[PDB]
Amino acid sequence: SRQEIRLGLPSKGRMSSDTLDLLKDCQLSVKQVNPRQYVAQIPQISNLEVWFQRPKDIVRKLLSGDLDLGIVGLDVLTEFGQGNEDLIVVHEALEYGDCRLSIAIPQYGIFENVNSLEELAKMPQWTEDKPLRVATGFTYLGPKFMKDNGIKHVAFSTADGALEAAPAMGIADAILDLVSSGTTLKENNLKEIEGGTVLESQAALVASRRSMIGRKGVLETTHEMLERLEAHLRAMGQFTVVANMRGSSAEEVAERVLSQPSLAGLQGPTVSPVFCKRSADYYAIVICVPKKALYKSIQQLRAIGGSGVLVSPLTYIFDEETPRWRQLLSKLGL
Amino acid sequence: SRQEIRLGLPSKGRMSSDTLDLLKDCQLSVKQVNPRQYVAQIPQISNLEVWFQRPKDIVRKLLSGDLDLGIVGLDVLTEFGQGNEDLIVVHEALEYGDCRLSIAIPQYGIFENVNSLEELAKMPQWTEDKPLRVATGFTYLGPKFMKDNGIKHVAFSTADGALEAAPAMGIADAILDLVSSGTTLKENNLKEIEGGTVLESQAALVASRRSMIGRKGVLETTHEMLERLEAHLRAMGQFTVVANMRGSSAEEVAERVLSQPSLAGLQGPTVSPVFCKRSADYYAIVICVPKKALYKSIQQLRAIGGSGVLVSPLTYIFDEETPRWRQLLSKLGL
Amino acid sequence: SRQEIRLGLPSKGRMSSDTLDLLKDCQLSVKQVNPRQYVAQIPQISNLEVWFQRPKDIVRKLLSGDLDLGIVGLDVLTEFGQGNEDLIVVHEALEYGDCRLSIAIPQYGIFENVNSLEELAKMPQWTEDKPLRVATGFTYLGPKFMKDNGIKHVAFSTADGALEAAPAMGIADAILDLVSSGTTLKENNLKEIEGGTVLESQAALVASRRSMIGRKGVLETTHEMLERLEAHLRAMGQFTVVANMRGSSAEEVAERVLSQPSLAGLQGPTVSPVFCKGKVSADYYAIVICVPKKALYKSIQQLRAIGGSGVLVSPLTYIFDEETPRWRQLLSKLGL
Amino acid sequence: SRQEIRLGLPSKGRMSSDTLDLLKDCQLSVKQVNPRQYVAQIPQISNLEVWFQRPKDIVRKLLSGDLDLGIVGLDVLTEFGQGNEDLIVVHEALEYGDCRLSIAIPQYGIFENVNSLEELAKMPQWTEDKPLRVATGFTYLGPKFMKDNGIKHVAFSTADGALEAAPAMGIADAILDLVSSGTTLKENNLKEIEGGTVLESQAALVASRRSMIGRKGVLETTHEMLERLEAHLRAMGQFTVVANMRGSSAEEVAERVLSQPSLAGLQGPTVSPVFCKGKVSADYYAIVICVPKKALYKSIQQLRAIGGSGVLVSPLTYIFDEETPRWRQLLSKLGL
Amino acid sequence: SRQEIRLGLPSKGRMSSDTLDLLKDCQLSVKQVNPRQYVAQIPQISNLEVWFQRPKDIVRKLLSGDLDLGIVGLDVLTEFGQGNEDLIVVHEALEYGDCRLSIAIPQYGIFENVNSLEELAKMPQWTEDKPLRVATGFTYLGPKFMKDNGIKHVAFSTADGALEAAPAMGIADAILDLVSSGTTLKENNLKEIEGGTVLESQAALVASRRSMIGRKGVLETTHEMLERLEAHLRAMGQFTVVANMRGSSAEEVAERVLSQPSLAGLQGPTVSPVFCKGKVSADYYAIVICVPKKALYKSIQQLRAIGGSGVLVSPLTYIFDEETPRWRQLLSKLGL
Amino acid sequence: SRQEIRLGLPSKGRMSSDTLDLLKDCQLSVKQVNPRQYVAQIPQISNLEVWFQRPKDIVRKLLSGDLDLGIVGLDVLTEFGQGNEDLIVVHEALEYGDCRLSIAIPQYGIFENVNSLEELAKMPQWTEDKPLRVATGFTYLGPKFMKDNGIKHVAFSTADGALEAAPAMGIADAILDLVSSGTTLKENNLKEIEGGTVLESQAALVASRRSMIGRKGVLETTHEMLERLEAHLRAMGQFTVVANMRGSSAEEVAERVLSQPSLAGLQGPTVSPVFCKGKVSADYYAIVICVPKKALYKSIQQLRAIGGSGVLVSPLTYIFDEETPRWRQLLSKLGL
């Protein structure tokens, strides 16, 4: 029917450039013969045509069938997708565009001892006649969230930006809007509440189910992208560690390391001998440790007769088969 | 309920900042006690509350009666206002936001020798079964424009941006979108056509009719706002001129320039005499000429014996009663 | 030793560039042959040599006899000058550098029902044993303000910056610092107090008494600078207005505007005839006045009430008065 | 066989952007439908076609006769024009692109007591065999300059950028190049000398002689262009000044002003009466003259000497003379 | 005389900044005590003086013997060098400064059906009476290119900038100039043609033959520069890969890998056992190859075919080969 | 009293941003919930509370016991700490904030043949009557420096900026100030001299002795901080190198490498066989060592003389020694 595999990418903003940067880091650089046209290509994967588009246009064109793949925030996906079974998240966490969609209410007067959705719902002020008015851009997700949390008496007004104005303006009581830093809303005398968070968004690789099950090339490129993306993301959270351990043999050392359950797993330790002039004073284990627990791991393996540790970076980590690929095939099935 | 008169200003972009620049030039500067909020005041006019909003919501809030006045582009006004007669344009030409909503088609294929709206409506390819597809943001105004120029075989897809893409992407045959500088649509191999323009927009002051009639202070402040805005805008296209004519009296000279009908009128000339000694060589006429016709007016005055001319700037020009104020009272039924 | 008149200008910040802007608007532009040296010149005044320094050092050098004139905030002058009689404020208000030195305390703690400086003095917790701890850069001015307000029980810690966080940090109970934008100290949960303002500051022209009497040309150039500065500052608050009025003579019209006391008190109106054309002459009369910017629209409405038609508003660049009070006041401060 | 009138404008740098700002200020705004082409239009003048070019290409294209008019620095005009009689400076002073082409020599070495052209010319070192080596961009003007002053023993290595290096590098003894700020060559241990500057440049309006005589509308638009530029430029050097004079009559006060010769020379003063009220009398009269900006303060002194009270200074956008002296000079250069 | 070894580096623009970044990436960082001067130095190599010059002055000074080494574009080398045998290209591809000198012609005109240089040479419009006019900065290389392709009906004009104008301006038929991104000449209705590329350029390391042969240190420092540069540039195209193979022995694994000819060319694999968690030991074996970045994914797939499992990719900073063929080729050019 | 551990970090300038960069690279990133406060956290360490402060106030609060740890320059530590023995420098060398406090002297006048501190002392001009006047912000250190080097008659004037002016405006004979780039004082015609440097400075980790001994948590987090920081700083001066050697056996090549004393010491080499091809196996062996960056090329020459060929240089992000010399030094400073 159509020859090329079409990837939609954000066109404007920091979301656009962060996406292009992530792609360059995975050897999926975008190239553009005509810089102020909206068509481009990733040469790494021939037959992959990219189309710069606004996040919701990407969701719209995935549904309408004019795109096969896309990168968008989970906010825009769940709002305009509306739970359509054709939209499949391939990677749910590209580690940018971090924000959450949450409820904000005034600190001020009638809301002062209210720090929970339970306690907000508990108030006597709201029956069907005078309901809890709440301004949002998420005209789909707001209703669904309130129904799903058993609150019947709410009325949503829509605004296309600057929602913080609504409570000061008197046009609503609460709001439902994106937050990432938390700056704006204390400065407009608003506050979040426990269980106010509707979802935590970030950039995601998304695909049409019909596109992937339909054409082998679409399934194959999605697989390549997934692997290249997670290989990059995994590596960004890992170091390779080279520690010098005391011991008579290589295999003796290997055990002591392999005994410690806290000590970081990978595929497994390698151990080669560290020479000196007299022969074989230390043994060099080569493991692969998460950045979060680097110092802990250094401390642990000092207790097990370790000495000099050499931390070096990783570019990529390709696991033989990703849990996400399994999960994706499972999401495709029905 | 509400006590205050409310002016909605654009919150974002060049539109926002140009608006604030204009208001400062007319002694209507906005002052913000809390810069991170959306509330503000214009000190010059007491009881006048400024809410920064998106242009779309300025229109909506004017209709929902949550704003009284607003500054907004005619594109956004006619699109989301939908001709609603509660919305009255007080000033239609604040001289920024200059752009036009017009149709653009490709220039390559079947359109190579199609340079008119009727020329493309004439084409056979478009039928009730497979019609002319046009991508637009202006979901309301497009259909309306096609009807009013007799084009029945048309279908409208929506998009949120990057409409230039759609012909190349093959999701549409033409687009209906804003154009100012005009570069963007050569860069995507598109062209405007004869009579393809739907409207020419710029920033405009508008007012709720229900607010003007039934809320105190609204018609008052609208009058002040209108006179101040116009006084500035008028003065921007004028110079005061002081030219030295040759003659034997003030009234002799006065009659010469007053009998030049091409000469630029103000309310009228003013003569004082220019002194010397060998007493009263030239006579100094002071008129007020449009900037557009300066050098012409200087040549004209040289034909009437004029020598030295001094051009100087004007800050404001207040006519006794503006035609725009008259036209408002006329639109109110008066 | 020295043979040139020296003007100290601020070296750093908005304060520096605001100063340089103001001097350019008054035809006193600073030229600089070596953009990152500290010496410079104002050419419009022969033998005037600029030296860029920190505000603090401008006060020091005025006192030390190394500068003759300086532009400096009143906060800095009073703190580092300490009411020294050699330092005279020539112009107390150049309408930039606006801020105030005021006391701030936490909203949260025991200070919820405390919004007056004597309410703060009233509180029982403080005594010579364990006094009111207060952080400030203004280590001279703080003590003086509270001695002068009869508050004996205070201890002054001294910081050089980031004072808004001393209460959070438990190093002091209140602070004494500058406020201008207003935002910073509500964001650190502090508040201002009634009577807690020590002084209003802004950029000011100061001069050395020793210099004015003792160095040739200083007083002459102080005079010129004062006059140009004030003319510009007065001019920035005025428009020239040309209203067209209805009358059968020049003087008839001149009365109706002069018998309106609400109408602006310039030096006085100028009436001249507006000619017009089958063959007629001289309908309106054009009065020219000099109205404050604040009350423009008011004064337009006033003139329309007495038969006014078209108003043309135009800018003023300088307004030189015959003799400013400030010049007389300076000579009186000098005993001249 | 070209049919439009063609103005060459600098395509690059601050030269380019100052040129466009000047033409905007004179209602000769440049409009460009395709910003990434080099062709453009000035709408105010019908038939006028701008071409953005590098200054030396502007000169080369005026000579080859692909342009009619151009704006370039007198530096590049003189270098590449070479005294060609087809080029005529219509305006030699647009008040931007200010720089001088001059000789710079080392401070440090055998030059410490050499502060003059003749002083360095007289020195015994330089001879037919080993000459005075001079690094320069200006390959035409260097030889011409030093022949015209009489320095036989000189050799001209050419370089096209970064000339201050040449002395320090050893490739030459002196440079000939552009200076403005005077900063750069203190930092490379060099100095200018007396009688060492070849030329003082700024932006200039230049016209082809063949174009003015030969092509329809060139001489006509050169006139318009000159008169609008000159009007703007004159107005930037002037103010209008209105002063209040105590007097009996308006001819009496005029006599007092006109017989002060050092006071400014606008075509002439205007006196109108100032009405005041007592009773509606008309005590003083309002003189309005137009005064050079540099001379504003003296002119106010000079007016207060003649019982002048309060002065209002205000700006001028343009001043058109009846016939600008430059137009008389241009016609003179054309053999009229 | 002169003691020091001199490297010319571009002074201006992006060429300058990219050259300085590359040298920093090779531990050949330039240090500059006086940023306003043109002299500087690289510490890592002793007695090496850096001089910032415009790229054509670099080529000019290499010829005159005032520089020993230089980094410039092959365009400016060939245009100003003119095949001079004193100039030798040591490294012809530093992977920045990429552009191509090519002929461009109109799209519209009569030129729509010519997309080849011989197809425009086939056009019979051009004779000795009225030849093919072509404007260019490259006055030496233009004729020499046209001569060598057999087109004697051409006359060259010279412009120094804004050459895309010359067709629309009417002053020439085609142009010869630099292209990289490709956008600028679409915007002026021009197109390239097949075979019309005169030269593909990039930044190159160049040396004077007289300097290498007859100056102490040059050949030595050239050797070091060449190797440090090429080591960095090679490592930018490579990764190191640590893949886990299923095997019964280390040498069994090594065989399976080396039996793949399509698999990467490291000097060889380094296999080591990977230990496993009751008392189990040593199931996987870890090879380390060194694959090009181009072929990474392919090579992972190739490895997974041979029972490869987890792969770890990590960066290289430098790859020093034993002998660089570029170094051997240099010595060859010195008759050595 | 107070429950958190408190680290002072610079609040303004490059000093502040370079500090936060270093802390980011050592997994000690600062997280600020409220950017417009001066309080912050490092999440990596439990109960650690960052306070942004001016460097002077970090020293002042370390003495007053309101902070436990700080990062400041050694310039600020010795001026404001004044050898106080509660203040202990934990790491003296964070490789940013590089400058030196040193005397500068005019080059022009009586000081032309004065390039030494003793030559300056020796000068007859200075006496108890009229001393050597020297301008400085370092009110404590200047006098102490002069008394330590027996300069008998010296008056010290204070300034808080723009000291380079002080000679030019005749208020001082010399200055004592920070110098980093060294450019600022050629511009203002000053020079440093032999023995001018009072101290060389850079950013340093500093701890309160009472806080280490008395407040538990501190010593533990100091250990952690020191180890992470030095681990980073050491890794910035190393590469890992993987040369491969021709050899018959594995400890044969280990020998030849360990016999070279000039070759890179780490803890020692590792070596594994490199396999390569009817059927051939195990030609050369891959040595892996850890060379300092400054000595990289030297080490590669060295390894080639031992029959080495290919070298693969790669980056290290941290090097953790088992126990650091600076930690031992810290303990011994706690009488331990």
Ligand SMILES: [Cl-]
């Ligand atoms: Cl936020």
Ligand SMILES: [Cl-]
């Ligand atoms: Cl557009």
Ligand SMILES: [Cl-]
């Ligand atoms: Cl503040």
Ligand SMILES: [Cl-]
């Ligand atoms: Cl210069």
Ligand SMILES: [Cl-]
């Ligand atoms: Cl290009």
Ligand SMILES: [Cl-]
């Ligand atoms: Cl410095």
